[PDB]
Amino acid sequence: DIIVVALYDYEAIHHEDLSFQKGDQMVVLEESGEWWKARSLATRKEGYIPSNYVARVDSLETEEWFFKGISRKDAERQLLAPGNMLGSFMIRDSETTKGSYSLSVRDYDPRQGDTVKHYKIRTLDNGGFYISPRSTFSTLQELVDHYKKGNDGLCQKLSVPCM
C-alpha cells in the first residue's frame, strides 16, 4: 500500500477526480502517469488525484520523536530553538543513508553552553537497531525507551521529543 497526505486542497471538477482537504489522507490505488488514483480516508470515495499535491507518509510519523526529511543542521536548529530542554531529542531520515536513521540529542558543555549531539543508529542485517554494539533493539521506540532510562554512552539520558 501507499499512504499519502494532501499538501494542499484540491477542488476537482470531474466525475472521477477526488477532491480533498489539506492534511487529508488517502490510500493510493493505481497510477495514471502523474495522476494517482486514490481512495480518500474520510469520504471513502475514489477518484484521480495530482500526485504533486500529496506526499507519502511512512509513519513512523505517528511518533512525536520522528521528524521526516529533516537535515542534520535544521535538526539542531530545532532542539536549540526555545521551548526545548536538555535531553530533548529526535530521530530522522539519515539523508546520509536513506532508510537509515540518526538520533540528535540536546546536550551541553559549560565551555560553550547548549549543544546538539548526533548518533548514528546502525541497523543489523537482522533488522533491529543499535547505536553502540552493546545495546540492540528490535524497534526504535524500544531504542528511544532505552536511552530514556539512562544515557548509556549518550551525552544525556533522553527526556522528551523535540518541540
Q: Are residues 65 and 50 in the same domain?
A: no
- CATH code, domain carrying 89: 3.30.505.10
Q: Are residues 47 and 94 in the same domain?
A: no
- What's the domain count of the chain? 2
CA gap 98, 85 in Å, rounded = 29
Using DSSP, state whether 10 is helix, strand or coil: strand
Q: Are residues 111 and 40 in the same domain?
A: no
Q: Where are the beta strands (DSSP E) in 20-86?
A: 25-32, 35-40, 46-50, 54-56, 66-67
Reported structure resolution in angstroms: 2.6
Strand partners, 3: 27
The DSSP annotation for 71-86 comes to: -HHHHHHHHHSTT--S
DSSP 17: B
Q: Are residues 78 and 157 in the same domain?
A: yes
DSSP 13: -
Omega before residue 143 within 30° of 0, cis:
no
Nearest Cα neighbor of 157 from 95, 85, 92 is: 85
Q: Are residues 49 and 96 in the same domain?
A: no
Helix (H) and strand (E) counts in the chain: 2, 11
Which one-letter amino acid corresponds to residue 54? V
Q: Are residues 53 and 76 in the same domain?
A: no
Using DSSP, state whether 119 is helix, strand or coil: strand
Q: Are residues 94 and 153 in the same domain?
A: yes
Residues 1 and 26: beta-carbon distance below 8 Å: no
- Residue 143 belongs to what H/E stretch? helix 140-146
Q: Which residue bears the cell 502517469?
A: 33
- CATH code, domain carrying 26: 2.30.30.40
Domain boundary residue, one of 34, 59, 84: 59
DSSP 64: T
Residues 107 and 118: beta-carbon distance below 8 Å: no
Q: Are residues 92 and 149 in the same domain?
A: yes
115: Cα within 13 Å, side-chain hemisphere: 12
- Sequence-distant (≥ 6) Cβ neighbours of residue 116 within 8 angstroms: 75, 76, 79, 80, 104, 105, 106, 107
Domain boundary residue, one of 10, 34, 59: 59
Q: Are residues 6 and 78 in the same domain?
A: no
Q: Backbone phi, then psi, for 36, in 5-degree steps?
A: -90, 130
Q: Are residues 79 and 144 in the same domain?
A: yes
Domain boundary residue, one of 30, 59, 88: 59
Q: Backbone phi, then psi, for 104, in 5-degree steps?
A: -105, 130
Q: Backbone phi, then psi, for 7, in 5-degree steps?
A: -85, -30
Q: Are residues 30 and 53 in the same domain?
A: yes
Method by which this entry was solved? X-ray
Which residues constitute the domain of residue 5?
1-59
Q: Are residues 27 and 92 in the same domain?
A: no
